[PDB]
Amino acid sequence: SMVSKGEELFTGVVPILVELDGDVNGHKFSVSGEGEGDATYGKLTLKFICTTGKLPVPWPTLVTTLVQCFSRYPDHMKQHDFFKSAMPEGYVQERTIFFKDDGNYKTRAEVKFEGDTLVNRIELKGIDFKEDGNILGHKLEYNYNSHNVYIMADKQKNGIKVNFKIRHNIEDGSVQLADHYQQNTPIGDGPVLLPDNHYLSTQSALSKDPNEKRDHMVLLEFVTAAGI
């Protein structure tokens, strides 16, 4: 029913660009990604490349870091889509991700429109990772589970928060938890509707391009909102 200024920008297929500057236990790296999203369908099609050489962490550990404005919201919930309604000037997304029995990532990102393209620019810092362990030791399977996340208004900070657990599969049948603590704030300074609490449901498929020499990840996703 409602169509905000920012929602108008997602009626079609939208080109995406992702740039990430990373540092984990002192290992510098960069990732760039390209593709598109279709928020009416609820899909993402992205390819990411490590431009520095070999990725010092598993690709699956980066998926949550590397644009929830491409979620499909039902008609009756359009007024609750903070992410699209923050556009074009966009939002800051901040996370701390704790890998159990291992180190942590801290991320700061800006998601906004630059011309006609939706751009996610990320800074990432990792620390206290065991050289032995599942991350630096690259013992994660190259796959990804379906996860629901509970989106919560945070009045005091004029944004939203999300606290969720990702289960990463390990080679030998076990699982590595990553506890995500997420905070999102508009970049604009105007009045803003904070959403009622609801859920995003994400499905993800990871693959490789047959013709790509560089360390890369092809990521397809399908995302829908529910729970109002």
Next chain:
Amino acid sequence: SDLGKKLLEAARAGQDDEVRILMANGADVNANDVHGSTPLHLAALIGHLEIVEVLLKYGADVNATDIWGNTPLHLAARDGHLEIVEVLLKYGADVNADDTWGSTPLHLAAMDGHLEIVEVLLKYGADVNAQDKFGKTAFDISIDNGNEDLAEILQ
């Protein structure tokens, strides 16, 4: 393909005249993108009935499935496109197709509150006792959402 990519885009963009041009110049009606989305998925998604019909006439697979388990009927039911639901069913859509979460078109239509679509799905043999993988039937969903009108016809 190539002519296939042009067709996927024109379908999604709702450019009806372009679609007709591509079709008569021999474009692959069953082209798909990397998600397995076909032009028929895309025209059903946006609710372009004339395009849905053209594509069916030229041999579109009514039961093409994306990698997420969505058929065009899933997308039409979810988005509330009644005449498109009707035509897909008439021309052989599987009314009880399950996506990845075990959701049939009846589940999606119930979740989004689309009464007339639910009535038509039931007419075509939609299973009121089919459970998704949270163990929910469409009826259970309508009760969760507090929808008297759906609950009454889904019981």
